[PDB]
Amino acid sequence: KIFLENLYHSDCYFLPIRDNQQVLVGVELITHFSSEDGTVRIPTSRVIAQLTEEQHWQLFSEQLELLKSCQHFFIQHKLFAWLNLTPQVATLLLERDNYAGELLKYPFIELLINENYPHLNEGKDNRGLLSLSQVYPLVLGNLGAGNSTMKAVFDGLFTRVMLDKSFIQQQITHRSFEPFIRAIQAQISPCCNCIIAGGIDTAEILAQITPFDFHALQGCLWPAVPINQITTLVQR
């Protein structure tokens, strides 16, 4: 019941993911970590770098427990939740005879990775990712970040893919490149139905992105909310 809270305090937020009509369809679970005594906020990358494999599992478990605690809300409003997947947790899910089960029972919870995931360029040849994708919803959170190829996408590993804010904003800022978004979207859609656009941070960006008809959108227009205020995101 303590998980990682004896080492770092997790102050958790939900990033709203809304469809092209702004209806809430899911949330991404994020954490602002503080030191144990609360004196300083610690960058997530620095927290994650330190963790042993068991600590990686504890942090994952703490987040799972948080999401499980919201299960009635997620099911009732038909939403999904993104939970960060690290390779350390991947190994434990795949190689223990009793870790994979709890996650499985909550299918609204989806495993989120980024283009920096180890050996992502192997696509379906990444044994761990292939295996997890066989039973869990897998999401690539930052397609277009320029840190991997799309092999894993065309290999069919993902349930959803989100185009990174840097990619979306680059093509919208340099307006003549907007067709590049359309071409990328068209090519990916058969291999992954659900394409999401990040970086929707201004009214102008939303106006430009709406005609693309992405399944969902994420960005500063819909600020993070503390996890206990998730009810503020849906109809009263």
UniProtKB/Swiss-Prot annotation:
The gene is ydiV. One of its GO terms (biological process) is regulation of single-species biofilm formation. Disulfide bonds: none annotated. The keyword Transcription applies. This is Putative anti-FlhC(2)FlhD(4) factor YdiV. Disruption phenotype: A double sdiA/ydiV deletion mutant leads to decreased cAMP levels which inhibits quorum sensing system 2. Repressed by glucose. Unlike the case in Salmonella typhimurium, disruption has no effect on motility or FliC levels. Upon overexpression acts as a novel anti-FlhC(2)FlhD(4) factor, decreasing its DNA-binding activity, able to negatively regulate expression of flagellar class II operons including FliC. Transmembrane segments: none annotated. SUPFAM superfamilies: EAL domain-like. Residues 1-236 form the EAL domain.
